[PDB]
């Protein structure tokens, strides 16, 4: 399922992520855009033999057990397959386990490279949220 940004933003915002751990809404929306380009079905395989799942490319070495990564801690405690639903709920409750661990939104590569230091409010304008 592909998200229109406002459709994404309102669901992140209804799920309480606007300014959750100091990160305003713009941040969450910009990182989903560069991390999966608003596609909850996105996948990516890194050099560690580990995959990123869905909308907020959550990695399987740590966050979920995918079955295929031998170093898992599966910290949001979910099947990485849940992270690919059409519905962001799990991606968000897990994305919330992530930003609360001492690293902050820098644990999203695309965020630190594409969103850190640009005006992220440009992502929710026009939306009525």
């Amino acid at each position, epitope marked *: 399922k592909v998200y229109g940004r406002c459709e994404l933003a309102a669901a992140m915002k209804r799920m309480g992520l606007d300014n959750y751990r*100091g990160y*305003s809404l713009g941040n969450w929306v910009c990182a989903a855009k560069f991390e999966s380009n608003f596609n909850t079905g996105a996948t990516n395989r890194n050099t560690d033999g580990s995959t990123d799942y869905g909308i907020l490319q959550i990695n399987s070495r740590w966050w979920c057990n995918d079955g295929r990564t031998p170093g898992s801690k599966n910290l949001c405690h979910i099947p990485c397959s849940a992270l690919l639903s059409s519905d962001i709920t799990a991606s968000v409750n897990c994305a919330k386990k992530i930003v609360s661990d*001492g*690293d*902050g*939104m*820098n644990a999203w590569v695309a965020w*630190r*490279k594409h969103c*850190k*230091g*640009t*005006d992220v*409010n440009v992502w929710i304008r026009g939306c009525r949220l």
Partner: antibody
Amino acid sequence: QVQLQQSGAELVRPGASVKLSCKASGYTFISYWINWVKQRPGQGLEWIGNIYPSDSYTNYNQKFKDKATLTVDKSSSTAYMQLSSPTSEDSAVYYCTRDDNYGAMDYWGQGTTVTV
Amino acid sequence: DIELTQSPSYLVASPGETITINCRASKSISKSLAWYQEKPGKTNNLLIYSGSTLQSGIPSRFSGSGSGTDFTLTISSLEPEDFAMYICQQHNEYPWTFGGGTKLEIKR
């Protein structure tokens, strides 16, 4: 106790290069953005740039990108800043500060006087 | 580059009274301002970050308000040691920019 401590004062002949250092401790270095700041008396503070240490991904103020190099030695947790040919104006105090994860700077180094 | 005007550059005050510094950005920095105290013989102190949030460990008497262009630092009950330089700094977009500094002198 998060602690950034920089190198000592420098006197440098015009145009000779000088490399400043900032040994980080108290946290896991590669995880925070390091910046470098400068202040001369009367000017306010100016940002040189930052770097993210697990990948040396560097962001440069357009005004400094021609004049300074930001580098890190992951192993020894030292952040570096060099100036390739300092002219008279570059005589200032240079500050390494850690990024709080928001863009503000929550710890600071003591500072380094570079006297060209 | 956001230009922050800080105001005034000098304030003198007597301990027990309240002071207020303003910070004006050249464009709206969406509540992304941070404030610093610089006392001589001391590393730079982050007081407040993102318009209103308190850095951990700081006395409550420190307060910020603002949203796009004007933001303020309110300092009530002046202690003889919280007499220092205060610097605002935008962190909404690159480059990170700072104000000019209010030198805050204890009065006599």
